[PDB]
Symmetry: D3
């Protein structure tokens, strides 16, 4: 086993994928934002705050998926065919945990794990930006790959 993102001189390169074949590739990444009770309360009630934080974070996440190659040095620029995000409130203890799941799809010679991970990361950062006025102690993550299909390494799926 060995790195693929370094060249003959030990420096970063964008791996040549010219020969590889084009297949349907999908990647699912997950992260979360743990928040204070106050933040959870204001995000789940429209009694006073009618603003939708998730709608904004969703948009940021989708747009981030498209900006992945602009942010990750060696990532290839791809023609994403689809990007969607799903939210779910959970309770990792007594604290409220917003779980974020990003799914990215494409047709090409390279996976979209980075696009999914980046979409999830920026989605979380946006939730943080929209709620930080209430509390700066919010915690993002862990962030990880849930699964990916297509490509050489076949189907990947985090064990649970």
């Amino acid at each position: 086993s060995s790195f693929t993102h370094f060249n003959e001189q030990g420096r970063a390169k964008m791996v040549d994928i010219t020969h590889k074949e084009d297949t349907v590739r999908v990647a699912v990444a997950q992260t979360s934002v743990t928040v204070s009770r106050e933040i959870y309360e204001k995000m789940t009630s429209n009694a006073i705050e009618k603003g939708d934080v998730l709608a904004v974070a969703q948009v940021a996440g989708v747009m981030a998926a498209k900006k992945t190659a602009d942010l990750i040095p060696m990532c290839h620029p791809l023609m994403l065919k689809g990007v969607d995000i799903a939210f779910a409130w959970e309770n990792d203890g007594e604290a409220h945990k917003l779980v974020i799941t990003a799914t990215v799809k494409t047709k090409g010679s390279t996976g979209v794990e980075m696009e999914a991970l980046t979409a999830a990361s920026v989605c979380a950062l946006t939730v943080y930006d929209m709620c930080k006025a209430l509390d700066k102690g919010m915690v993002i993550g862990p962030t990880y790959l849930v699964e990916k299909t297509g490509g050489k390494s076949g189907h990947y799926r985090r064990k649970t």
Copy 2:
């Protein structure tokens, strides 16, 4: 207490900071990447792999700090005065944990918490991109604010 990023119609807005005063503001954010033993071994030895993953991730993180306003919908575009990142290998158990700490500085009417958090997040994503060929099970985070100075809310510092 209340959200600041929503307008009179319950939709997202970039808060007007015209009246606020310009002061020295700093923000420190932290995250990490937990990796397999193989990834740790190849990143800490130059015997075969001479490529520097941290050098690439560092560059990505600094550039991400500058792209923060392009990624986070309601963030103000700022003239960052400084951005630096520090790395440290730790052992959150028997697994190797790369700790990433991003520090951002500026002079203005709004904090740089998002710039620091974004810098740290993309730095981590880049480490993941550079090592994923070896293992897709890497875990990023938790990501959180360590401290921030300047501004209304005074000095913030996560308790440890």
Copy 3:
């Protein structure tokens, strides 16, 4: 009277504003999207379509204000202090007309008319993108400046 955006050789330049003074500047721009009855009905009822088109368009508009200098060749890159957008349904006849009003604020040596106009334009384009599946005949505009304050030319205000 004469152009300011052309140089000694008759080609485009970014006008030097080094000597000018920094003052509070605001700009308000307006546009609209005329839509079919079906589009209006689905955007104003949550009975089936619960998606908020305006929330997405609002985010796009704010982000576009920040990208103004990236899109308009000779515009100066500014540290926007605030950006907000307001919506209102009107009836320019028997057809439904969504009126969009973008307000941009800053502190500097140049106005933000372009930022407001661009914010409004992209906000409208986003409404169009979100509803085009229903009808491609939507009409955007007219788009124009409502008013601007600060600067040499003093206070401007479109007569009505």
Copy 4:
């Protein structure tokens, strides 16, 4: 009929077009800029002002077509195969009206209506930026789709 840009949770998503087939797609959009007599005179005579406003606006429009996915939240990033813009002075009354027509072409599973509309919009905004020193009362639009070919909805063509 129903929206396609919203997901199972009522939030924005980039529609999956993985299954669709790749065909030749074209889109033509139109807009205009109504200007004062003075602006028209200086743009149509090289006696004193030799700067070419249309050359600058043309460049901005083409570049905007490529930035469409960066500006419109749910638009797919495409490999545009061609982008061209045409100008024509008209007289919508006694006032001078610069008509702008943008044509975008590509080969893929999704239309380029947004790319054409965005190209036209930014082209107009650039004309406004280059002439605003003379008058801020310029009016942009209406902006609309003239026609599009390829895709499910077959050939579209605005009736005149």
Copy 5:
């Protein structure tokens, strides 16, 4: 003497300029494009080719000045106050040489040498892009700083 763009760990950082004072800074950079006789002939006659290559290259150069921080890893994002470019045909022998001179101005705690150099470089690349259909043998450069004012290192001026 020592590098300023590396941190305590030997990796890239954006130097903190928080303490420095804000002064008027200017930078002038120069480059050129050596072309074949055919390219020179078509660029200097409107008999058949009426397209203005310099107008396009000028726009690209100005826009590149603004994108400098997006391209150069450790450059600070600045509020440029002015950007202009000048062209001149010369004869570095019997071959035609288009000389490009970019001038950038700002008010801040850091010079704009990179903005001027980048503006000149992209301006040249654009001339190349517009004429490559005629010949791929065009040569760009040398590219260098002509002079800079303001800052610690005082006034710099290349000896001739």
Copy 6:
């Protein structure tokens, strides 16, 4: 022979390549940075300065290849399949000359000469940015195309 980047009205357009066929295309560009003895000494010894300038410049160059269409007005946005850069110190006299060679690969209907040239140019500019603290007299270039394969004009190769 004639320009391809101008339309029927003598203004810039992105040439339609819809009909052309997709083939493997490669482009190799070269440039250099001539530096003072002091700069060469600090870049080739780790005795004190352990920072790797080439690692940073390499990353900037690869990322610039992907940003080519954002910088060069009429360039088509492509799905680059590979980007690599190679360095070599030479002595164009008694002065030290860092030679930079960028290779870009893709599969499509248009060459990647601009991507290679842009990658090389920004790589050089980054070396300059990282070393300018030591000397502002560094000279970049000449920059030129070494060779390109695929496409109509067949195989191109600069004579030496």
